[PDB]
Protein backbone atom coordinates (compact mmCIF):
# COMPACT_ATOMS: atom_id res chain seq x y z
CA UNK A 1 0.00 0.00 0.00
CA UNK A 2 1.29 3.44 -1.05
CA UNK A 3 4.62 1.92 -2.08
CA UNK A 4 5.02 1.63 -5.85
CA UNK A 5 2.31 4.21 -6.46
CA UNK A 6 3.54 7.78 -6.11
CA UNK A 7 6.72 7.45 -4.07
CA UNK A 8 8.55 4.49 -5.58
CA UNK A 9 8.40 4.60 -9.36
CA UNK A 10 11.63 4.25 -11.29
CA UNK A 11 13.03 2.09 -8.50
CA UNK A 12 10.17 -0.37 -8.97
CA UNK A 13 10.96 -0.17 -12.69
CA UNK A 14 14.56 -1.15 -11.92
CA UNK A 15 13.53 -4.04 -9.65
CA UNK A 16 11.00 -5.28 -12.22
CA UNK A 17 13.81 -5.31 -14.77
CA UNK A 18 16.12 -7.14 -12.35
CA UNK A 19 13.41 -9.68 -11.51
CA UNK A 20 12.63 -10.17 -15.20
CA UNK A 21 16.27 -10.26 -16.32
CA UNK A 22 17.69 -12.60 -13.69
CA UNK A 23 14.64 -14.86 -14.10
CA UNK A 24 15.96 -17.37 -11.56
CA UNK A 25 14.37 -17.15 -8.12
CA UNK A 26 17.69 -17.77 -6.38
CA UNK A 27 19.41 -15.27 -8.67
CA UNK A 28 16.96 -12.55 -7.67
CA UNK A 29 17.41 -13.68 -4.08
CA UNK A 30 21.15 -13.25 -4.65
CA UNK A 31 20.56 -9.63 -5.66
CA UNK A 32 18.53 -9.10 -2.50
CA UNK A 33 21.25 -10.83 -0.47
CA UNK A 34 23.72 -8.31 -1.84
CA UNK A 35 21.27 -5.64 -0.70
CA UNK A 36 20.94 -6.95 2.86
CA UNK A 37 24.69 -7.32 3.41
CA UNK A 38 25.15 -3.81 2.01
CA UNK A 39 22.45 -2.63 4.43
CA UNK A 40 24.09 -4.59 7.24
CA UNK A 41 27.26 -2.51 6.74
CA UNK A 42 29.08 -5.53 5.32
CA UNK A 43 29.96 -4.63 1.73
CA UNK A 44 31.15 -1.30 0.35
CA UNK A 45 29.39 0.71 -2.39
CA UNK A 46 31.55 -0.49 -5.27
CA UNK A 47 31.57 -3.98 -3.77
CA UNK A 48 27.78 -3.92 -4.16
CA UNK A 49 27.84 -2.80 -7.80
CA UNK A 50 30.67 -5.21 -8.63
CA UNK A 51 29.01 -8.18 -6.93
CA UNK A 52 25.92 -8.05 -9.13
CA UNK A 53 28.12 -7.65 -12.24
CA UNK A 54 27.46 -11.29 -13.46
CA UNK A 55 23.79 -10.42 -13.03
CA UNK A 56 23.08 -6.82 -14.03
CA UNK A 57 26.30 -6.17 -15.93
CA UNK A 58 24.81 -7.84 -19.00
CA UNK A 59 22.30 -5.01 -19.16
CA UNK A 60 23.97 -1.57 -19.62
CA UNK A 61 20.75 0.40 -19.04
CA UNK A 62 20.02 -1.62 -15.91
CA UNK A 63 23.52 -1.54 -14.44
CA UNK A 64 23.84 2.17 -15.22
CA UNK A 65 20.54 2.83 -13.43
CA UNK A 66 22.02 0.99 -10.47
CA UNK A 67 25.22 3.07 -10.63
CA UNK A 68 23.24 6.31 -10.94
CA UNK A 69 21.13 5.36 -7.93
CA UNK A 70 24.18 4.47 -5.83
CA UNK A 71 25.92 7.65 -6.89
CA UNK A 72 28.69 5.61 -8.46
CA UNK A 73 31.13 8.22 -9.72
CA UNK A 74 34.20 6.29 -10.91
CA UNK A 75 34.99 9.53 -12.72
CA UNK B 1 -1.50 -37.81 -12.10
CA UNK B 2 -0.34 -35.03 -9.75
CA UNK B 3 -1.58 -34.35 -6.20
CA UNK B 4 0.82 -37.00 -4.94
CA UNK B 5 4.04 -35.02 -4.67
CA UNK B 6 5.17 -31.40 -4.33
CA UNK B 7 7.72 -31.64 -7.13
CA UNK B 8 7.61 -29.53 -10.28
CA UNK B 9 5.73 -30.94 -13.25
CA UNK B 10 7.54 -28.87 -15.84
CA UNK B 11 10.90 -30.69 -15.61
CA UNK B 12 12.71 -27.49 -16.52
CA UNK B 13 11.28 -23.95 -16.11
CA UNK B 14 11.62 -21.26 -18.77
CA UNK B 15 15.27 -20.25 -18.42
CA UNK B 16 17.94 -20.43 -21.11
CA UNK B 17 20.38 -19.20 -18.50
CA UNK B 18 22.29 -21.59 -16.23
CA UNK B 19 21.53 -19.13 -13.46
CA UNK B 20 24.17 -16.37 -13.06
CA UNK B 21 26.75 -17.15 -10.41
CA UNK B 22 28.13 -14.46 -8.14
CA UNK B 23 31.88 -13.99 -8.02
CA UNK B 24 32.80 -13.39 -4.39
CA UNK B 25 36.50 -13.52 -5.15
CA UNK B 26 36.28 -10.02 -6.61
CA UNK B 27 35.41 -8.67 -3.17
CA UNK B 28 38.16 -7.16 -1.07
CA UNK B 29 39.76 -9.27 1.66
CA UNK B 30 38.48 -6.67 4.11
CA UNK B 31 34.95 -7.04 2.75
CA UNK B 32 34.97 -10.83 3.17
CA UNK B 33 36.41 -10.55 6.67
CA UNK B 34 33.77 -7.93 7.42
CA UNK B 35 31.05 -10.36 6.36
CA UNK B 36 32.57 -12.92 8.73
CA UNK B 37 32.70 -10.39 11.56
CA UNK B 38 29.21 -8.96 11.11
CA UNK B 39 27.59 -12.37 10.61
CA UNK B 40 29.90 -13.82 13.28
CA UNK B 41 31.62 -16.73 11.56
CA UNK B 42 34.15 -18.35 13.93
CA UNK B 43 37.13 -19.58 11.95
CA UNK B 44 40.70 -20.80 12.28
CA UNK B 45 43.70 -18.41 12.26
CA UNK B 46 45.67 -18.14 9.03
CA UNK B 47 42.78 -17.40 6.68
CA UNK B 48 43.51 -16.49 3.07
CA UNK B 49 41.56 -14.85 0.24
CA UNK B 50 40.35 -18.14 -1.25
CA UNK B 51 39.47 -19.43 2.21
CA UNK B 52 37.38 -16.35 2.94
CA UNK B 53 35.53 -16.56 -0.36
CA UNK B 54 34.63 -20.21 0.25
CA UNK B 55 33.38 -19.58 3.78
CA UNK B 56 31.58 -16.38 2.79
CA UNK B 57 30.09 -18.06 -0.25
CA UNK B 58 28.96 -21.07 1.75
CA UNK B 59 27.09 -18.85 4.20
CA UNK B 60 26.06 -16.37 1.49
CA UNK B 61 24.15 -19.19 -0.20
CA UNK B 62 21.97 -19.32 2.92
CA UNK B 63 20.86 -15.76 3.66
CA UNK B 64 17.18 -15.18 4.60
CA UNK B 65 15.81 -12.26 2.62
CA UNK B 66 12.49 -10.47 2.02
CA UNK B 67 11.69 -8.63 -1.23
CA UNK B 68 9.64 -5.71 0.11
CA UNK B 69 11.73 -5.03 3.21
CA UNK B 70 15.07 -5.59 1.50
CA UNK B 71 14.11 -3.24 -1.33
CA UNK B 72 12.93 -0.70 1.23
CA UNK B 73 16.22 -0.86 3.16
CA UNK B 74 18.24 -0.57 -0.05
CA UNK B 75 16.25 2.37 -1.43
CA UNK B 76 16.20 4.09 1.96
CA UNK B 77 19.88 3.87 2.88
CA UNK B 78 21.27 4.58 -0.59
CA UNK B 79 19.04 7.64 -1.07
CA UNK B 80 20.09 8.81 2.39
CA UNK B 81 23.59 7.77 3.41
CA UNK B 82 25.64 5.83 0.89
CA UNK B 83 27.75 3.72 3.27
CA UNK B 84 27.93 5.70 6.51
CA UNK B 85 31.15 5.40 8.50
CA UNK B 86 30.27 6.40 12.09
CA UNK B 87 33.14 4.92 14.08
CA UNK B 88 31.78 3.54 17.35
CA UNK B 89 32.47 0.42 19.39
CA UNK B 90 29.37 -1.43 20.61
CA UNK B 91 30.45 -4.30 22.85
CA UNK B 92 33.05 -3.29 25.41
CA UNK B 93 34.89 -6.61 25.40
CA UNK B 94 38.14 -4.95 26.46
Curated annotation (Swiss-Prot), chain A:
| Superkingdom field | Eukaryota
Q: In which tissues is it expressed?
A: Widely expressed. Highest levels in testis, lung and thymus. Expressed at relatively high levels throughout brain development. In adult mice, expression is high in neurogenic regions such as the subventricular zone, rostral migratory stream, olfactory bulb and dentate gyrus.
Region annotated Interaction with SAP30 sits at 6-73
Instruction: State its location(s).
Output: Nucleus; Nucleus, Nucleolus
Regarding how it is modified after translation, the entry says:
SUMO1 sumoylated by TOPORS. Probably desumoylated by SENP2.
Signal peptide range: none
As stated in the Swiss-Prot or TrEMBL entry, residues carrying the post-translational modification N6-acetyllysine are: 17
Q: Which residues form the PAH domain?
A: 4-73
Q: What does the UniProt entry report for the null mutant? A: SIN3A knockdown causes a significant decrease in the amount of cortical progenitors in the proliferative zone at the peak of neurogenesis, and results in altered neuronal identity and aberrant corticocortical projections.
| Function, as annotated | Acts as a transcriptional repressor. Corepressor for REST. Interacts with MXI1 to repress MYC responsive genes and antagonize MYC oncogenic activities. Also interacts with MXD1-MAX heterodimers to repress transcription by tethering SIN3A to DNA. Acts cooperatively with OGT to repress transcription in parallel with histone deacetylation. Involved in the control of the circadian rhythms. Required for the transcriptional repression of circadian target genes, such as PER1, mediated by the large PER complex through histone deacetylation.
Assembly and interaction partners: Interacts with ARID4B, BRMS1L, HCFC1, HDAC1, HDAC2, MXI1, SAP30L, SAP130, SFPQ and TOPORS. Interacts with OGT (via TPRs 1-6); the interaction mediates transcriptional repression in parallel with histone deacetylase. Interacts with BAZ2A, MXD1, MXD3, MXD4, MBD2, DACH1, NCOR1, NR4A2, REST, RLIM, SAP30, SETDB1, SMYD2, and SUDS3. Interacts with PHF12 in a complex composed of HDAC1, PHF12 and SAP30. Interacts with TET1; the interaction recruits SIN3A to gene promoters. The large PER complex involved in the histone deacetylation is composed of at least HDAC1, PER2, SFPQ and SIN3A.
Q: What is this protein called?
A: Paired amphipathic helix protein Sin3a
| Species | Mus musculus
Origin organism lineage = Eukaryota, Metazoa, Chordata, Craniata, Vertebrata
Portion of the parent chain present: 456 to 528 of 1274
Swiss-Prot record, chain B:
* Protein name per UniProt: Histone deacetylase complex subunit SAP30
Instruction: Please indicate which superkingdom the organism of origin belongs to.
Output: Eukaryota
Positions bearing Phosphothreonine: 19
Q: Where is this region: Disordered?
A: 4-17
Q: Where in the cell is it found?
A: Nucleus
Q: What residues does the Glycyl lysine isopeptide (Lys-Gly) (interchain with G-Cter in SUMO2) crosslink join?
A: 68, 88
Membrane-crossing residue ranges in chain numbering: none
Q: How does it assemble?
A: Component of the histone deacetylase complex that includes at least SIN3A, HDAC1 and HDAC2. Found in a complex composed of at least SINHCAF, SIN3A, HDAC1, SAP30, RBBP4, OGT and TET1. Interacts with HDAC1. Interacts with SIN3A, SIN3B, HDAC2, RBBP4 and NCOR1. Interacts directly with SAMSN1. Interacts with HCFC1. Interacts with SAP30BP.
Q: Which residues carry this modification: Phosphoserine?
A: 5, 12
Physiological role: Involved in the functional recruitment of the Sin3-histone deacetylase complex (HDAC) to a specific subset of N-CoR corepressor complexes. Capable of transcription repression by N-CoR. Active in deacetylating core histone octamers (when in a complex) but inactive in deacetylating nucleosomal histones.
- Signal peptide range equals none
Q: Where is this region: Interaction with SIN3A?
A: 4-94
Q: Which gene encodes it?
A: Sap30
The similarity annotation says: Belongs to the SAP30 family.
Amino acid sequence: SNASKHGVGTESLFFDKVRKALRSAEAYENFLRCLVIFNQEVISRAELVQLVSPFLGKFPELFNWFKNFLGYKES
Amino acid sequence: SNAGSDDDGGDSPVQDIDTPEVDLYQLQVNTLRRYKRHFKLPTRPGLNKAQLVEIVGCHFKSIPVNEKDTLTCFIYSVRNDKNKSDLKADSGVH
